[PDB]
Amino acid sequence: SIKVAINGFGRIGRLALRQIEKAHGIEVAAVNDLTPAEMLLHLFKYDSTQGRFQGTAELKDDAIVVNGREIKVFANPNPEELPWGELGVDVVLECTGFFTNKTKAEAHIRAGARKVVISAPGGNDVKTVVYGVNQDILDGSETVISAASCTTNCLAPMAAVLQKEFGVVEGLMTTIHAYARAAALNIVPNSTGAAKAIGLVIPELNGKLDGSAQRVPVATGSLTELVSVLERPATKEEINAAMKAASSESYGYNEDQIVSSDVVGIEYGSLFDATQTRVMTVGGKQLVKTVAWYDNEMSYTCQLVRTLEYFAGKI
């Protein structure tokens, strides 16, 4: 049974523990955070947006007991000094935001852990995995991997169906991110690398996509729009049917008229919105728009934990 440690028991780290508690063959043995256990427990159990933890959780000396099992709590800012080897930790879920490349994340391996999964893009010597699109690139010999970004997890399953079933010539992405000091009150255009980087996840789309982001100062569901030129003719109905045929626990399918609060709490990495699909045909030339939603916290966390569980099965 695989032992995990969560480094950074923040928004993502806490939700990741909620999801790992649903699984067999894997358990969190320890968490590390700069915040005292007392407050971390309250934030883990009670959440205004993602609801109450569905399980038991209590505080002990230097530990939290979740569903009857002790989880050690540490507060050490330096990962090299954590007792991962002494505790037999197999995999560290790195969720602090401060160790998001290979050389920084390998501090966990110098501390005795065997593997690391970064909760963010990890650089170019680190495999990047969107569960449901490319987890089969993992064979278990990797030491550090990445579960990509929230935008990549939203875009990739949609782009993958378009590429597999129609062929993509090119496309431009616009992501509306529901969240420097400007961003609190303004719509703010922002660079993203997610579309440019999509070849890390879908090699066939390398060099075919670009895009950017509009950061909107409201906390709610986010969305990614893709405007593409395809290699074969398409109807709205045919595109929507292909997306539904691909739907899964990672890729949801929606045909309701929804608003952004309806997305909060989904466990899909991406929720394809079939009501927004449009195909413009002018003189035989076609231009296609497709839109998928994501819950920036929960969608990413559920993908992260799926990727972790799959990786954990390869060792």
Ligand X SMILES: NC(=O)c1ccc[n+]([C@@H]2O[C@H](COP(=O)([O-])OP(=O)(O)OC[C@H]3O[C@@H](n4cnc5c(N)ncnc54)[C@H](O)[C@@H]3O)[C@@H](O)[C@H]2O)c1
Binding residue ranges for NAD(+): 11-12, 33, 77, 119, 296
One residue of 19, 32, 174, 254 binding ligand X per CB under 6 A: 32
Q: How far apart are CA 97 and CA 120, in angstroms?
A: 8
Choose between 101 and 212: whose C-beta lies nearer to a copy of itself: 212
Measured on CA atoms in the order 117, 123, 129, 130, is the torsion positive or negative? positive
Where do we find the tokens 């008229």?
Answer: 257
Which region, judged by CB under 6 A, interacts with ligand X, from 56-64, 134-142, 267-275, 295-303? Answer: 295-303
269 binds, among a copy of itself, ligand X, none (CB under 5 to 8 A by kind): none
Rounded to whole angstroms, how far apart are CA atoms 208 and 169? 7
Per partner kind, with CB cut-offs from 5 to 8 A, the member of ligand X, a copy of itself, none near residue 32 is: ligand X
Catalytic residues: 150
Using CB under 6 A as the binding rule, the residues of this chain from 103 to 122 that contact ligand X are 119-120
Which listed range, 97-105, 124-132, 213-221, 266-274, lies at the site for ligand X (CB under 6 A)? 97-105
Q: Is 180 in the site for a copy of itself (CB under 8 A)?
A: no
Q: How far is the CB of 140 from a copy of itself (least distance, A)?
A: 35
Say whether residue 233 binds a copy of itself (CB under 8 A). no
Secondary structure (3-state) at 89? coil
| φ, ψ for residue 314, nearest 5 deg | -90, -5
* 313 part of the interface to ligand X, by CB under 6 A: no
| CA-wise closest residue to 44 among 24, 67, 78, 23 | 67
Output the furthest CA–CA distance in the chain (Å, rounded). 72
**Amino acid present at 56:** T
222 contributes a contact to ligand X by CB under 6 A:
no
Strands (E), the chain: 2-7, 26-32, 57-60, 63-66, 69-74, 91-94, 115-118, 127-128, 144-146, 168-178, 188-190, 209-216, 222-230, 251-254, 270-273, 278-282, 285-294
Quick check: 52 binds a copy of itself (CB under 8 A)? no
Does residue 224 touch ligand X according to CB under 6 A?
no
232 binds a copy of itself (CB under 8 A): no
Interaction partner, residue 223 (ligand X, a copy of itself, none; CB < 5-8 Å by kind): a copy of itself
The residue from 34, 39, 182, 315 that contacts a copy of itself (CB under 8 A) is: 182
Strand partners, 2: 26
Residue 295 interacting with ligand X (CB under 6 A): no
DSSP 204-258: GGTTTEEEEEEEESS-S-EEEEEEEEESS---HHHHHHHHHHT--SSEEEE-S--
Which member of 128, 220, 224, 303 binds a copy of itself (CB under 8 A)?
A: 220
Least separation in angstroms between residue 185's CB and ligand X is: 18
Q: How far is residue 229 from each of residues 161, 236, 278, measured CA to CA in Å?
A: 14, 14, 12
Q: Which is nearer to ligand X, 46 or 98 (CB)?
A: 98
Decide if residue 300 touches ligand X (CB under 6 A).
yes
Sheet holding 91-94, edge to edge: 57-60, 63-66, 69-74, 26-32, 2-7, 91-94, 115-118, 144-146, 127-128
Vertex 187 angle, CA 186 and 188, to 5°: 100
- Using CB under 8 A as the binding rule, whether residue 138 contacts a copy of itself is answered as no
**By the criterion CB under 8 A, which residues form the site for a copy of itself?**
169-172, 174, 176, 178, 182, 185-189, 207-210, 212, 214, 216-218, 220-221, 223, 225, 227, 229, 259-261, 273, 275-276, 278, 280-283, 285, 287, 289, 291
Interface contacts to ligand X, rule CB under 6 A: 7-13, 32-35, 77, 95-98, 100, 119-120, 150, 296-297, 300
